[PDB]
Amino acid sequence: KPSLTLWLDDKMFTGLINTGADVTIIKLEDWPPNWPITDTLTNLRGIGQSNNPKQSSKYLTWRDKENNSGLIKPFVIPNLPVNLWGRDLLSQMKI
Incomplete structure (x- = not known):
C-alpha cells in the first residue's frame, strides 16, 4: 500500500509513504492549531523560504x-495536498 495511518500524540493522521525524504511533512490544514510550531530556517528539499x-x-x-x-519532529507547511512520512519516521517502524 502507498499510505499509512498513525497517531502523532493524541491525533490520528494519514499520509503517503515518502521514503525518498529524510524528514516528515504534515499539511498545515491537518495541524492542530493548539500545537506549537516554530518558523524554521532548515533547508527542506523542494521547499522555499517563501513557503514559510x-x-x-x-x-x-x-x-x-x-x-x-x-518520536518525530515533523515540518508543517501550507498548500501541501497530503501528509508525507519520511525516513525520520519510517526508519523507526517495522517495514
Missing part, C-alpha cells in the same frame, strides 16, 4: 496500530 515552512516545536510521540512507538 515551520517545524513542530516539540517532538511528537508516534504510535502505530500495534502500539509500537517512537
Whole structure:
C-alpha cells in the first residue's frame, strides 16, 4: 500500500509513504492549531523560504496500530495536498 495511518500524540493522521525524504511533512490544514510550531530556517528539499515552512516545536510521540512507538519532529507547511512520512519516521517502524 502507498499510505499509512498513525497517531502523532493524541491525533490520528494519514499520509503517503515518502521514503525518498529524510524528514516528515504534515499539511498545515491537518495541524492542530493548539500545537506549537516554530518558523524554521532548515533547508527542506523542494521547499522555499517563501513557503514559510515551520517545524513542530516539540517532538511528537508516534504510535502505530500495534502500539509500537517512537518520536518525530515533523515540518508543517501550507498548500501541501497530503501528509508525507519520511525516513525520520519510517526508519523507526517495522517495514
